[PDB]
């Protein structure tokens, strides 16, 4: 039922590829990054580095700021609350949409994107992968792994040195000068 | 807003790779296979044939019979109702689990699997992919694409012809003569 893996002393994901498994609600590998809880149910180890499966949940007003991925495609499927997704296409045209549970957003590689959770404890199902493989361990590497359940009581704010080195390692480029005009 | 694609007259999936998009609840490309409605939000064309994203929903008691995928890994993430997932590992050990919303099941390649919807209008989020590519257009191939919304009124029955033509073009081998020994399903128990 419980396993030890390269990522956690205690996990419900098995260390060996090829093994079927089940995980109850909430019990994937957990990470905190600012106010968000990220929960990983499958990683690249489970899929020969083809895809992953994770949830992100957070408090009202939590922002994932503008960033892009050079070799990763990313799915946003809302399961709780309401999440406003901002996207810029390759040509520079911007759009925003308030996604409610069961709605879907797709962000192709090199498209700048950001989102804001607009309800308390909103939750997004994410899959993010591409030719480059998968990068779900980005969140615990920039932020921190967590054993506790539920939202971080205090936001985990990464040290500037982490921002300097970690994001490029996981195909994340933040775009701090980006401006949204989607109104 | 809408688009004409390789798969549908009217789709909310852009035909051109590299384009961001949004789709509201229910309005992905739809397919019927027996009693179930499959709704595709992203396919291989969107991800350089890396992964896909779809939902499967259906009536109480609906069963997807035993099958396996030789190169495809499959995710079950329950969003509505309750779904019992049966899996046989590579050793032959079988397990079953009732998955409720928020719960997760994973089926590695070459593992025989089946599931049963145990509430009306249960719903699964699925990803089905692997080193060989992505699996999603299987449902409308064995079954039929659909324009209406909601569960099929009557089960769409594939012609038996399709059941050993269509399977191979996709990565699915049916196991009609598979026996479950886990209980909670017909079969001889442990
Ligand atoms: Ni992103
Ligand atoms: Ni399957």
Contacts of A182 in chain B (CB under 8 A): none
CA distances from B59 to B28, B50, B56, B154, B155 (A): 19, 31, 11, 11, 10
Angle (nearest 5°) at CA B51 between A20 and B4:
140
Contacts of B83 in chain A (CB under 8 A): none
| Contact yes or no for A104 and B77 at CB 8 A | no
Instruction: Give the number of other CB atoms < 10 A from CB of residue B59.
Output: 18
CA distance B47 to A126: 14
CA distances from B92 to A162, B49, B69, B181 (A): 45, 31, 15, 11
Beta carbons of A72 and A132 less than 8 angstroms apart: yes
Beta carbons of B79 and A161 less than 8 angstroms apart: no
CA distance B109 to A46: 10
CA distance B72 to B123: 21
Distance from the Cα of A26 to chain B's closest Cα (Å) equals: 7
- Classify the C-alpha dihedral B138-B143-B146-B148 as positive or negative: negative
In sequence order, which residues have a C-beta less than 8 Å from that of residue B80 and are 6 or more positions away? B57, B101, B119, B121, B122, B123
CA–centroid distance for B147 within its chain: 18
| Residue B24 token pair | 């509201």
CA distance B24 to A82: 12
In chain A, how many H helices and how many E strands? 2, 14
- The number of domains in chain A is 1
* Residue A67 falls in which region: left (phi positive, over 0), alpha (psi -120 to 50) or beta: beta
In Å, what resolution does this model reach? 1.8
Contacts of A77 in chain B (CB under 8 A): 41, 53, 125
CATH number at residue A142: 2.60.120.10
CA–centroid distance for A120 within its chain: 17
Radius of gyration (C-alpha) of chain A in whole angstroms:
16
Beta carbons of A17 and B130 less than 8 angstroms apart: no
State the structure-solving technique: X-ray
The burial of A67, by beta-carbon neighbours within 10 Å (0-12 exposed, 13-18 middle, 19 or more buried), is given as middle
**What are the φ/ψ torsions at residue A169 (nearest 5 degrees)?**
-65, -20
Which residues face A38 on adjacent strands?
A31, A56
Distance from the Cα of A105 to chain B's closest Cα (Å) equals: 4
Helix (H, G, I), strand (E, B) or coil at A123: strand
Helix (H, G, I), strand (E, B) or coil at A160: helix
State which residues form the domain around A6: 1-183
Radius of gyration (C-alpha) of chain B in whole angstroms:
16
């Amino acid at each position: 039922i419980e396993y030890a893996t390269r990522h956690r002393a205690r996990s419900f994901i098995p260390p060996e590829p090829g093994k079927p498994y089940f995980i109850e609600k909430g019990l994937g590998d957990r990470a905190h990054l600012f106010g968000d809880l990220i929960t990983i149910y499958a990683g690249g180890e489970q899929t020969e580095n083809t895809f992953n499966f994770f949830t992100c949940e957070g408090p009202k007003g939590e922002v994932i700021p503008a960033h892009s991925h050079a070799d990763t495609y990313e799915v946003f499927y809302i399961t709780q609350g309401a999440v406003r997704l901002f996207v810029e296409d390759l040509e520079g045209e911007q759009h925003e949409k308030l996604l409610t549970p069961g709605d879907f957003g797709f962000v192709p590689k090199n498209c700048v994107h950001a989102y804001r959770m607009e309800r308390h404890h909103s939750q997004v199902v994410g899959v993010a992968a591409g030719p480059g493989g998968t990068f779900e361990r980005f969140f615990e590497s920039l932020g921190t792994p967590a054993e506790e359940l539920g939202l971080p009581v205090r936001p985990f704010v990464p040290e500037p040195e982490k921002f300097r080195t970690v994001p490029e390692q996981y195909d994340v480029r933040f775009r701090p000068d980006h401006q949204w005009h989607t109104g």
